[PDB]
Structure formats: C-alpha cells, structure tokens
Amino acid sequence: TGQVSVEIEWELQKENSKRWNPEIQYTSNYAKSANVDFTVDNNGVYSEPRPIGTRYLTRNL
Amino acid sequence: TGQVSVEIEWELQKENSKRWNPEIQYTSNYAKSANVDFTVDNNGVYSEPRPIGTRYLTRNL
Amino acid sequence: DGVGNSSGNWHCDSTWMGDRVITTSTRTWALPTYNNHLYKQISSASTGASNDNHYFGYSTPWGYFDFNRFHCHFSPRDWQRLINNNWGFRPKRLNFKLFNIQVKEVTQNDGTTTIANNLTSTVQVFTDSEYQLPYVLGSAHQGCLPPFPADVFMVPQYGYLTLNNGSQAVGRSSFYCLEYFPSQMLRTGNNFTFSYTFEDVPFHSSYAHSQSLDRLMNPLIDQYLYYLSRTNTPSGTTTQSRLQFSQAGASDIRDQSRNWLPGPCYRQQRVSKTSADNNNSEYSWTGATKYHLNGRDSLVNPGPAMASHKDDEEKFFPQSGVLIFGKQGSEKTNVDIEKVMITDEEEIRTTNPVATEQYGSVSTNLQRGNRQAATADVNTQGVLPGMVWQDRDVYLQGPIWAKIPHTDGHFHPSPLMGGFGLKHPPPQILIKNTPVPANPSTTFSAAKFASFITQYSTGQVSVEIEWELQKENSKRWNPEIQYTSNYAKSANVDFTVDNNGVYSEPRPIGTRYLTRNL
Amino acid sequence: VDIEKVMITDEEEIRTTNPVATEQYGSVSTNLQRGNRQAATADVNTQGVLPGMVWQDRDVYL
Amino acid sequence: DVFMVPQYGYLTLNNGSQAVGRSSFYCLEYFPSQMLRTGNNFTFSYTFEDVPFHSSYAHSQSLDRLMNPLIDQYLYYLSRTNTPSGTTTQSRLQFSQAGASDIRDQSRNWLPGPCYRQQRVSK
Amino acid sequence: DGVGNSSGNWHCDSTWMGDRVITTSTRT
Amino acid sequence: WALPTYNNHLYKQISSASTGASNDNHYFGYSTPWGYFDFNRFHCHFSPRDWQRLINNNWGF
Amino acid sequence: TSADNNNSEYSWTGATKYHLNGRDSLVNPGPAMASHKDDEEKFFPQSGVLIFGKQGSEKTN
Numbered sequence: 010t011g012q013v014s015v016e017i018e019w020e021l022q023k024e025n026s027k028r029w030n031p032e033i034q035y036t037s038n039y040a041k042s043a044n045v046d047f048t049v050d051n052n053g054v055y056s057e058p059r060p061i062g063t064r065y066l067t068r069n070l
Numbered sequence: 071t072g073q074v075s076v077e078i079e080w081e082l083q084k085e086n087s088k089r090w091n092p093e094i095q096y097t098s099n100y101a102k103s104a105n106v107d108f109t110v111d112n113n114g115v116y117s118e119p120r121p122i123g124t125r126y127l128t129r130n131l
Numbered sequence: 132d133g134v135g136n137s138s139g140n141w142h143c144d145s146t147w148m149g150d151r152v153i154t155t156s157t158r159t160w161a162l163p164t165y166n167n168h169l170y171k172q173i174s175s176a177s178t179g180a181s182n183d184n185h186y187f188g189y190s191t192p193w194g195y196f197d198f199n200r201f202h203c204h205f206s207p208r209d210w211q212r213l214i215n216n217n218w219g220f221r222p223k224r225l226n227f228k229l230f231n232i233q234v235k236e237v238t239q240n241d242g243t244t245t246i247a248n249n250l251t252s253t254v255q256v257f258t259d260s261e262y263q264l265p266y267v268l269g270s271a272h273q274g275c276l277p278p279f280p281a282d283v284f285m286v287p288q289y290g291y292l293t294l295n296n297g298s299q300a301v302g303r304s305s306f307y308c309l310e311y312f313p314s315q316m317l318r319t320g321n322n323f324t325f326s327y328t329f330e331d332v333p334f335h336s337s338y339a340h341s342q343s344l345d346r347l348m349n350p351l352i353d354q355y356l357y358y359l360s361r362t363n364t365p366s367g368t369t370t371q372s373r374l375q376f377s378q379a380g381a382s383d384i385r386d387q388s389r390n391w392l393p394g395p396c397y398r399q400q401r402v403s404k405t406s407a408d409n410n411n412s413e414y415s416w417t418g419a420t421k422y423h424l425n426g427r428d429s430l431v432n433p434g435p436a437m438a439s440h441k442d443d444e445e446k447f448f449p450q451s452g453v454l455i456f457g458k459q460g461s462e463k464t465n466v467d468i469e470k471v472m473i474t475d476e477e478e479i480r481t482t483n484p485v486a487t488e489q490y491g492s493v494s495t496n497l498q499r500g501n502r503q504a505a506t507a508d509v510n511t512q513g514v515l516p517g518m519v520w521q522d523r524d525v526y527l528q529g530p531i532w533a534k535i536p537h538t539d540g541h542f543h544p545s546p547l548m549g550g551f552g553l554k555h556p557p558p559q560i561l562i563k564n565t566p567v568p569a570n571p572s573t574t575f576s577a578a579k580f581a582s583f584i585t586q587y588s589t590g591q592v593s594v595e596i597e598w599e600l601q602k603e604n605s606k607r608w609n610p611e612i613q614y615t616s617n618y619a620k621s622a623n624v625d626f627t628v629d630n631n632g633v634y635s636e637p638r639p640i641g642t643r644y645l646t647r648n649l
Numbered sequence: 650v651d652i653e654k655v656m657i658t659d660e661e662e663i664r665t666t667n668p669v670a671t672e673q674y675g676s677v678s679t680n681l682q683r684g685n686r687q688a689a690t691a692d693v694n695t696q697g698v699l700p701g702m703v704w705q706d707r708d709v710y711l
Numbered sequence: 712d713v714f715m716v717p718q719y720g721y722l723t724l725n726n727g728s729q730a731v732g733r734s735s736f737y738c739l740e741y742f743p744s745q746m747l748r749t750g751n752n753f754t755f756s757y758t759f760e761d762v763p764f765h766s767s768y769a770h771s772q773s774l775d776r777l778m779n780p781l782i783d784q785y786l787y788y789l790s791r792t793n794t795p796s797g798t799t800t801q802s803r804l805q806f807s808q809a810g811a812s813d814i815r816d817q818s819r820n821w822l823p824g825p826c827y828r829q830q831r832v833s834k
Numbered sequence: 835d836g837v838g839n840s841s842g843n844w845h846c847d848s849t850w851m852g853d854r855v856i857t858t859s860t861r862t
Numbered sequence: 863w864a865l866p867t868y869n870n871h872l873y874k875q876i877s878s879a880s881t882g883a884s885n886d887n888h889y890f891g892y893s894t895p896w897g898y899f900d901f902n903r904f905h906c907h908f909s910p911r912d913w914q915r916l917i918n919n920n921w922g923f
Numbered sequence: 924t925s926a927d928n929n930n931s932e933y934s935w936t937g938a939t940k941y942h943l944n945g946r947d948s949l950v951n952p953g954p955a956m957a958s959h960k961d962d963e964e965k966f967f968p969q970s971g972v973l974i975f976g977k978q979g980s981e982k983t984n
Contacts, residue, residue, distance in 0.1 A: 010863065010864045010865070011863060012863075013863055013899060015901045015906070015907065017907055019923050020764075020923065021916075021920050021922070021923050022764050022920060022921045022922035022923065023919070023920060023921070024919060024920060024921050025261070025263070026263070027263040027264075027307060027311060027312065028305040028306060028307055028771075029108065029109070029305075029306045029307060029308045029311065030098065030106055030107060030108040030109055030305065030306045031096065031097070031098045031107075031108065032097075032098065032918075033097055033098055033100050033302070033303055034095040034096065034097040034914075034918050035092065035095065035097075035914045035917060035918055036092070036093075036094055036095040036096075036097045037091065037092045037093065037094055039094050045091055046091060046092075047090065047091040047092065047910040048090070048091055055712070057711075057905070057910075058656075059656055060656055060658050060710045060711070061710060061711045061910070061913060061914070061917070062658070062659075062662070062708045062709070062710055062917075063708055063709040063710070063765065063767045063916075063917050064662050064708055064766065064767050064768060064769050064917070065767070065769070065917055065918060066767060066768050066769070066917075066918070066920075066921060067303050067305055067768060067769045067770065067771045068537070068768035068769070068770060068771060068921065069262075069263070069264070069265050069266070069305075069537075069770070069771050069772060070536050070537070070538075070665060070666070070770040070771065070772050070773070070774060070777070071567060071568055071862065072862070073316075073841075073842065073844070073860055073861070073862055074860065074861050074862075075842070075844075075845060075858065075859070075860040075861075076858070076859055077845075077856065077857070077858040077859075078856070078857055078858075079854060079855075079856045080854065080855045080856070080857065081853060081854060082853045082854065082855060083853070084853060087911065089911055090909050090910065090911060091910055091911060092910050092911055092913075092914045093911065093914065095914070095918065098302065099302060100301075100302045100303060101302055102296045102297075102299045102300060102301055102302055103299060103300055103302060104299055104300070105172070105300065106300045106302070106304050106306055108306075109172070109306045110169070110170045110171060110172060110189070110306075111171075111172060112171055112172050112173070112174075113169075113171065114166070114167075114169030114170060114171050116170075132836075132838070132839060133836055133837075133838045133839075134836075134837060134838040173780060173781075173811075175811075175814075180814075183814070183815040184812075184813060184814045184815055185814075186776055186780060186811065186814050188776075188780050190780075190781055250837050250838060251837065253840055255844050257844075265771075265772060265777075266777075267777075267778070267779040269777065269820055270777060270778040270779065270784065270817070270818075270819075270820075271784050271785060271786055271818055272778070272779055272782040272783065272784055272785070273782055273783050273784065273785050274782050287779075287781070287782050288781045288782070289779070289781075290779050290780055290781045291772070291779065291780075292772060292776035292777075292778065292780055293771055293772050293776075294665070294770075294771065294772060294773060295776075303662075303769060303771070304771065305771040310844075310846055310860075311846045311847070312846060312847060313843065313844065313845045313846065313847050314843065314844035314846075315843050315844070316840045316842065316843055316844055317840060318838055318839060318840040319838050320836075320838030320839060321838070321839065321840055343943070343944065344943065345943055345944075345946070345948055353982070355975070355976065356951070356973060356974060356975070357974035357975070357976060358949065358951060358970065358974070359934055359969055359970070360934060360983070360984055361932065361934055361984055362928065362929070362931070362932050362933055362934045363930055363931065363932050370930055371930065372925055372926075372928045372929065372930045373925055374925065374928065375984035376974060376984070377982065377983050377984055378976070378982045378983070380982075385946070385947070385948040385949055386948075386949050386951075387949075387951070388951035388952060388973075389948075389950075389951060392941065392950075392954075393941060393943050395697075395699050395700070397677065397699060398677045398678050398679075399678055400678040400681075400682065400688050400690075401678075401681050401682065402682075402789070402792075402804065406802055406803055406804065407684075407802075408683065408684065409682070409684060409792065409802045409804065410682045410683065410684040410686070410687055410688065410792070410802065411684060411793055411800055411801065411802045412687055412688070412792070412793065413791065413792050413793050414682070414687065414688040414792055415789055415790060415791055415792045417688070417690075418678065418682070418687075418688030418689075418690060419676075419690075420675070420676065420677055420678055420690070421675050421676045422674060422675035422822065422823060423668065423669075423672055423673055423674060423675050423676075424664075424668060424773070424774065424775055424823050425664045425665075425669065425773065425775075426669065426672070427775070427815070428675065428676075428815070429775055429815040429816075429819075430788065430815060430816050430817075431675070431819075431822075432786070432788060432816075432817070432818035432819060433818060435699050435700060435701065435822075436700070438944070441944060441945035442944060442945055443945075450678075450789055451788065451789070454786060454818075455786060455787035455788070455806060456785070456786070456787070457785070457787060457808070463783070463807065463808045463810075464790070464807050464808070465790055465791055465805035465806070465807055466787075466805065466806050466807070467803070467804075467805065467806075468804050468806065470806070471787050471806050480943075480944045481944075484942065484943060485942075485944065485945065487678070487681065488942055488945070489942055490941060490942060491939070491940050491941035491942050491947065491950070492938075492939065492940045492942075492947075493939055494937065494939055494969075498928070498929045498933070498937070499927065499929065500926075500927065500928060500929040500930060502929070503929055503931055503933065503937075504929065504931070504933040504936070504937030505937075506936075506937060506938075506939070510677045510678070510679065510691065511677050511693050511696065512697070513696060513697015513698050513699060513825070514697060514698050514699065514700070515697075515954050516954060516955070517954065520700065522700075528785075533820045535703075536666075536703050536774070536821060538666060538703045538704065538705055538766075539704065539705045539706040539763070539766050540703070540704050540705075540706065540824075541702065541703045541704070542698045542699070542700060542701075542702050543700035543701065544701075545700060545701065546701065546820040546821070547701045547819065547820050547821065547822070548818060548819075548820050565862070566862055568862075652834060657834075662769040663769075664773075665769070665770035665772070665773045665774060666770070666773075666774050666823055666824055667823060667824045668823050668824065668825075668826045670826075670828070670829040671828070671829055671830070671831035672828075673826075673828065674823075674825075674826040674828075684802070693826075694826075694828040695826065695827055695828060696825050696826045697825055698825050699822060701820070701821055701822050702821070702822045702823065702824055702825065703774065703821050703822070703823075703824060704823070704824025704825065705766065705824070706765075706766065709765055709767075709904070710904070711904050711905045711908060711910070711913050713863070713864060714863055714864075715863070715864050715865075715866065716863050716864070716865045716897040716898070716899065717897055717898065717900065718868045718869075718893065718894070718896070718897050719893075719894045719896040719897055719898045720876070720891060720892060720893040720894055721891055721892060722889050722890065722891035723890060723891055723892070724890070725877070725888055725889055725890035726961045726962075727885075727888050727961075728877045728878050728879035728888055728890060729890070730890050734890065736892060737892075738873065739894055739896050764921075764922030764923060765922050765923055766921070766922055767916075767917055767920055767921055767922055767923065768921050768922075
C-alpha cells in the first residue's frame with residue numbers, strides 16, 4: 010500500500026465577451042432536498058447525480 | 071445637449087472557497103422565449119425582467 | 132482641423148511598382164439615421180414563413196462600410212493587366228480613411244424640404260478589431276462601394292441573426308449593444324484612419340492547366356505494371372473463365388496506373404439555357420441539392436468547386452452550382468435568363484469533376500459465378516488520400532475574402548464563393564449619427580426622448596490595398612489565351628457609361644487565362 | 650441495467666455546426682433531366698469531409 | 712476513498728483464437744526498474760506538447776444564419792422553373808435574389824461537418 | 835477647442851484587469 | 863492505493879478459446895503480474911466546485 | 924483459382940472507375956486497402972494491387 014500524488018498544471022483562456030444580457034451558467038438547484046448533490050449520504054457513499062459538460066459560455070460563430 | 075461620461079474604478083475581493091460541491095450561481099433560463107431578458111423588444115423598448123441581488127456565493131458564518 | 136480647412140485629398144490612383152501593386156479608391160457616401168436611433172428585434176413571426184425560413188435577430192441604428200468586392204479596388208483595365216500577366220496574387224496591407232464629414236439638418240415644416248448644415252453635431256465611428264461582433268461582411272450583400280468612381284452610395288444598415296427555435300429566441304441567444312464599445316466621435320474637420328495587415332495567405336491561382344489529370348503519361352513509352360485485360364476466353368468453342376493480364380500503353384490509355392485522383396464532388400441537377408430542353412415540372416426546390424442542419428434544410432450555393440459542363444455542351448449548367456450575377460438594371464424577383472449573366476467554371480475540369488455528372492462507379496457485391504459482378508455509381512464523394520483539386524474562380528464582381536468561422540476543426544478553409552479565407556479579416560467599420568434631441572418640455576419627465584432632429588451625414592471614404600503578385604514565367608512556344616475586348620464596332624463600348632450616364636458591366640471576368648503544367 | 654440506472658449525455662449544444670446524428674446529411678441529385686424524365690434526388694446518409702466544412706469536437710465531461 | 716491498482720495486460724494479433732505469428736510478447740521484467748522499499752519514494756515530471764485548447768464555449772448563431780437579414784444579396788438563384796402563362800404550364804427559368812423573405816436560398820461560404828448516421832431510440 | 839473639433843471620444847468599455855475592475859459609460 | 867499480487871507472479875496468455883465466442887468476439891493476448899496507475903479521468907483532478915469555476919469563467923483550457 | 928471466377932467478361936464493366944470530364948478511366952491501384960481477409964489468400968482486388976511481370980513476360984494477354 011502507499012500514497013500517490015498527481016499534480017497537473019493547466020493553462021486557461023479567459024472569457025472576453027461583450028454581450029449585453031447574461032450568460033447561461035452551471036448552477037446547483039437552490040430547492041431543498043434530502044441529499045445535497047455531489048455529496049456523501051448517511052451511509053458514507055459518494056455519488057455524482059448527473060454528468061457535467063464543459064460548454065456553457067457562448068461565443069459568435 | 072451634450073455627452074456625459076462617468077468612469078468608476080472598483081476594488082474586488084476574490085472568492086476563495088474550499089467547499090466540495092457546486093455553488094449557486096446567477097443564470098439566465100435556457101428555455102425558449104418570445105423575448106430574451108434584458109433586451110429590447112420589437113418596438114425598441116428596453117426592459118429589465120426581475121431584480122438581481124448581489125449575494126449568491128456562500129461562506130461560513 | 133477647422134471648418135474651412137480640408138480633411139483629406141482625393142487619391143484614386145494605382146501604381147504597379149514591382150511585383151507589388153497598390154490600388155486606391157475614394158468614394159462619396161451618405162448615412163441616414165436608421166430605426167430612429169432604436170435597437171429593434173426582428174423575426175419571421177406573423178409572416179407565415181416555412182420552417183426553413185424562420186429567423187430571429189436584431190437591427191441596429193448603426194451602419195457599416197463594405198469594400199469586400201474586387202471591382203471596388205480595380206478598374207476593368209487594371210483587372211486585365213492583372214490576369215493576363217500574373218499567375219497569382221494575394222492582399223498584403225490595407226489602409227482606410229474617412230474625411231470631409233458633413234452633417235446636415237432637414238426641415239419639413241412648410242411641406243417643402245429645407246437642408247442646412249450643422250457644424251457642432253458629430254458622427255461616431257469604431258472599428259471592431261477584437262472581433263466580438265457578429266461578422267456580416269462575408270455573405271455577399273449589397274451595399275458595397277460602387278464600381279464606378281463617380282457614384283454616390285448609401286451606407287447599409289447593420290444587423291445580425293442569432294439562435295432561434297421557430298420565431299422564438301432560444302435563450303442562449305445573445306444581444307449586443309454597439310454603444311457599449313469605445314467610439315471615436317468625429318465632427319466636421321476631423322478624420323479617421325486605420326491600417327491593417329493581412330496574415331499570410333496562399334496566392335490565388337490565376338492559371339489554368341495545360342494537361343488533364345488523366346494524361347500525365349509519356350505516350351511513347353509503355354508501363355511496366357500490368358492490369359487485368361480479359362476475364363474469359365473463346366477457347367473451347369464456348370466461353371471459359373481465364374484471367375489474362377496486359378501492359379498499358381497509348382493503345383489503351385484509360386487502363387494505366389495513376390498516382391492521383393480527381394477532387395471531391397457533391398452532385399447537382401443539370402439545367403439548360405435552352406428553354407425547350409428543360410422539364411416542365413417545378414423541380415426548383417424539390418430537385419435541388421440540399422443540406423440538412425438542425426431539422427431545417429437549406430440550399431447549397433454555390434457548393435464545392437466543380438466543373439460546369441463537359442467538353443461538348445456549353446448550354447448546360449448546374450442548378451445551384453454556379454455564381455449568377457445580374458445585369459445592370461435587373462429586378463429582384465423572377466427575372467428571365469436574359470437579365471442575368473451566368474459564370475462558367477469550365478477551366479477547372481482538368482482536375483475537378485463535372486458538377487452534374489457522377490464521380491465514378493464502385494463494386495457493389497462479390498462475384499462467384501453463380502453471381503455476376505455489379506457496380507453502383509458514386510454521386511457524393513468525400514476527400515480521399517491522394518486527391519487534388521482547384522479552388523473556385525475569382526471574378527471582378529465577386530467577393531475578395533471571407534471570415535473563417537472559429538471552430539474546433541475545419542478542412543481547407545478556402546471559402547465556397549471564392550476568395551481568401553481569413554482567421555482575422557479586415558475589421559468591420561461601424562458608423563452612426565449621434566442623436567440630437569428636439570426641444571424638451573420645461574417640466575421634468577423620466578420617459579426617454581421620442582423626438583429628435585432629422586439629420587444625415589455625408590463624407591469621403593478612401594481604401595488602399597497593397598497586393599503581392601506572382602509573375603508568369605512560361606516557356607511555352609505558342610501564344611497564350613488573353614482577355615481581350617472585341618475590336619468590332621458597337622453602339623456602346625463595354626464597361627462604359629451610356630448616353631444617360633448609367634455604368635454597366637457586360638459580362639463577368641474570371642481570373643484564370645494563363646496556362647500552366649499540371 | 651434499466652434506463653433509470655444510467656445517465657445519458659446530451660450533445661445538443663453542438664448542433665449550430667454539426668449535423669444531427671439520427672437525421673440525414675442532405676440530398677443529392679440522382680439523374681439528369683430531359684423532360685421525358687423528371688428530376689430525382691437521393692439522401693446522403695454518410696458524408697466524408699469536403700473542402701469548406703466546419704465542425705466542433707465532442708464535449709468534455711467531468 | 713482507497714482504490715486497488717488494476718492489472719496490466721494487452722491484446723495482440725489473432726486469427727480466431729490462435730496467434731498470427733507476427734504477434735509479439737513483452738516481458739516487463741526486461742526493462743530498467745527502480746526498486747522501492749519503505750522509506751523510498753518515486754517521482755517523475757512530464758511536459759505536455761503543444762495541443763489546441765479545448766473549446767468550452769457554445770455558439771451564439773447557427774452556420775445557416777451568418778447573414779445580415781436587412782440587406783439583400785447581389786447573387787441570384789433559380790426560383791421558378793415553369794410558368795402558368797399559356798393557360799397551361801410551360802418551362803421558363805426565372806431567377807430571384809435572396810433576402811430575408813427566402814432565407815434558405817442564399818449563397819453561403821461554409822458547410823456543416825461530416826456525418827456517419829445513427830439509429831434513433833427514445834427514452 | 836473650436837467649432838469644428840470634437841471635445842471628446844465615446845468610451846463605454848469596461849476592463850476587468852486584476853482585482854480591480856473599471857467600468858465606464860457615456861450618455862447623451 | 864493497495865496492490866495485490868496478480869497471477870501469482872506469472873505471465874499467462876489469454877484468449878477466447880473454449881468460450882464459444884462469435885467471430886467478432888475473438889481475442890488473443892497476455893496478462894501480466896504488473897499493475898498500473900490511471901489518472902486519465904477529469905474528476906480525479908477536479909472537485910465539482912473547481913469544475914464549475916472552470917467552465918463558467920473560461921473559453922478553453 | 925480459375926474455377927471460382929465468373930464466366931462473363933466483367934473486366935471493364937465490373938471495374939472500379941472514376942469519371943473526369945466526360946470520360947471514365949480505371950482506378951489503379953487506388954487508395955491503400957488490404958488485399959484479402961484472414962482466411963483467404965487466393966482472392967485479390969481486381970484493380971487494387973500492383974502487378975509485376977516475370978522476366979520474359981510479353982506485353983498482351
């Protein structure tokens with residue numbers, strides 16, 4: 010047994026957008042729930058509720 | 071008549087948050103609509119649909 | 132600087148220097164106020180449009196300058212000096228000016244019209260150099276600088292389309308307020324300039340080819356490769372199957388081995404300039420060649436670059452496959468074939484397939500001898516390794532460049548209408564009259580002004596493009612084909628005004644005359 | 650496992666450029682017309698790359 | 712969470728269940744290894760070669776609609792192949808000029824991406 | 835300075851820089 | 863991590879023989895005593911919060 | 924094998940052709956593709972392979 014440690018450095022491209030109205034963003038629903046999403050449950054099991062894509066921000070074709 | 075120009079410089083305090091699960095964010099609804107919000111209409115009138123508060127991100131009390 | 136000084140000189144000249152050529156042109160423009168200074172959304176709602184025809188977008192008070200056609204920068208004489216002597220050309224450097232701006236008030240009070248200057252009022256101009264705005268200049272719209280330098284043109288209105296579902300907006304649709312960008316406010320006595328450098332782009336090819344992709348061989352010598360000449364023999368008083376192999380030479384010129392393949396194809400329907408040879412049904416939309424994107428199909432124009440017709444038949448052309456220009460004074464809707472001038476791509480058939488014909492044939496099944504061999508025809512062919520093709524031709528009346536969409540992938544960015552694909556094109560230049568309010572009421576009110584002074588502005592615009600040339604070096608003995616004006620007498624010289632002052636261009640002029648070895 | 654036990658990704662942000670997976674690419678003229686013969690078209694199910702095509706790569710997920 | 716390290720294995724050329732004979736065999740013991748004991752550690756660093764940015768944006772406008780809806784094109788297309796003239800239909804080619812009225816008929820510089828078609832099923 | 839010269843340009847842009855942000859707006 | 867001994871320190875060949883597999887399903891290969899580290903999924907390197915901080919603010923990475 | 928082939932003359936008609944400027948020519952050798960499947964060594968594509976002559980091979984048939 011042992012420990013493993015991975016470290017990745019990522020380069021980002023920042024959004025520069027002149028649109029007037031607001032973007033679509035990724036948000037967690039604010040309504041009440043028996044279990045917070047992306048969280049353990051009372052038995053200790055971690056679950057991911059839905060897949061999360063990478064494209065929300067919009068840009069001119 | 072004439073032109074008026076105001077320029078304000080703001081200082082920001084960046085979010086540093088170690089929570090695991092995702093934040094609540096401000097988002098425009100992605101469903102289709104006859105009029106995009108925060109946009110002019112076919113007569114040229116600009117309207118703001120709802121008030122937008124400043125507090126979404128969360129922090130430990 | 133002042134009211135009495137002049138902002139700039141008229142330079143329309145061109146200088147041919149060395150392998151460079153520098154073309155310059157100046158025009159006079161007039162800018163109305165569009166929309167009454169209002170941003171409005173536009174759509175296909177209430178129109179009763181078919182699913183293919185729906186759109187959603189915004190129209191703006193702004194207007195824009197479009198120099199994106201060749202005859203803006205070239206006279207007919209400078210164009211044949213270009214295409215007769217040169218194998219290729221590309222744009223290098225650009226320069227732009229607005230000067231001698233004049234704003235003018237209008238007065239309808241008496242029922243007469245009354246016009247006076249306004250020395251104080253301004254006009255605001257910004258160039259979009261970071262490419263945040265939707266780029267409209269690549270769609271071959273009207274409103275470009277006039278062909279003939281003596282003409283005054285009206286600056287076209289700016290507007291754009293965004294995502295729609297039916298007539299409704301999607302919600303990922305975006306809205307741009309052009310007032311939200313830094314502008315330069317010009318008053319009479321102020322001028323506006325900027326310069327732009329094109330990134331490295333391939334030379335356009337002004338040559339044709341001297342020899343077809345079929346015939347690259349030496350006809351005298353024979354190949355050392357074999358092919359399958361005969362599958363059966365008369366031997367035995369009846370036919371029996373025996374494979375013979377033969378060696379390919381001028382006797383059978385079609386059977387040789389070759390290193391290269393013709394370019395790709397997306398097939399078109401064939402129509403004839405002769406009214407009698409066409410079918411009597413309406414196939415215009417139903418028999419068309421379409422692509423299907425997001426549940427709505429649109430027509431393919433002009434499409435991938437393909438030859439117009441075979442050797443013999445000049446009258447046939449592909450339905451959607453060619454660029455069609457109108458003659459001077461041609462109406463918008465349902466004009467007869469005599470009112471339009473149809474381009475002819477036939478110089479390109481050395482490599483590219485014919486638009487109306489099939490690409491080839493392909494074996495359908497395996498044969499045994501209880502089963503004969505069968506083939507099927509290939510109407511659509513994507514790129515294969517070892518294919519060579521030519522881009523579509525450039526015309527004096529046609530577009531210079533297009534903007535390459537910003538996407539994860541694209542293949543051979545050359546635009547389909549012809550011209551130079553550019554990741555960063557020449558920026559858009561947007562211009563607008565600054566609103567001047569009519570007298571407000573003396574008591575205060577928070578509603579915005581619906582009343583303005585009626586006014587418009589005029590001025591001078593000057594565009595200067597530097598082109599790089601590739602000179603012809605050709606060792607052929609006999610003379611080239613050149614572009615020539617017919618020497619016979621005529622009531623009107625071509626590319627010339629008539630007795631009423633109207634300038635007309637008789638026929639489209641392609642860029643490829645000189646020939647070169649494939 | 651039943652469809653409730655799996656989470657299916659949705660690529661619909663990409664349909665600005667790329668075609669819909671289940672739909673045809675387009676239609677293409679099959680034959681030459683004369684006027685003893687009407688024009689006919691056939692549908693293109695498979696399309697390889699042509700010059701002047703633009704597309705988006707598939708999306709990245711957590 | 713604690714995870715168990717997965718086993719390494721590979722496939723090579725086969726004809727049926729049998730090997731081809733151009734199939735290869737690799738003994739991993741045949742490579743230089745670093746032998747670690749409790750109190751030893753192992754590190755290495757790696758630099759990615761230049762690769763395109765992934766695209767986290769969507770698009771604001773479809774490849775169909777890149778046009779200015781207000782202005783009209785100067786190119787023509789073939790609008791009508793026949794005429795009612797003559798109390799019966801006869802073949803005459805008319806050409807029209809494309810604008811917001813007919814938005815599907817305009818000339819365009821670009822084509823959609825490629826396709827390899829799938830069968831459709833419903834949730 | 836004069837009648838024919840312009841007194842100032844239209845700047846409506848905003849720049850997000852570092853922890854600073856600078857917003858600018860012009861009106862008539 | 864925890865690493866068992868696989869195969870009892872033996873290289874073995876594996877195949878679809880005796881399984882009665884269709885022609886599409888045949889294979890031939892080798893399994894080894896070794897094991898390997900796989901960090902090739904994104905949620906190894908990102909929390910759900912660091913992922914929406916990524917995708918909401920950035921055009922590319 | 925001479926017996927497994929069909930008795931008709933398909934040499935040109937059953938061939939794989941491309942059509943350029945109103946005249947169709949044969950594709951040789953064509954794009955690079957495998958000659959045969961795993962089992963069957965005797966089959967080869969009609970126009971798809973390079974065919975060399977042995978020393979002292981005549982020109983025709």
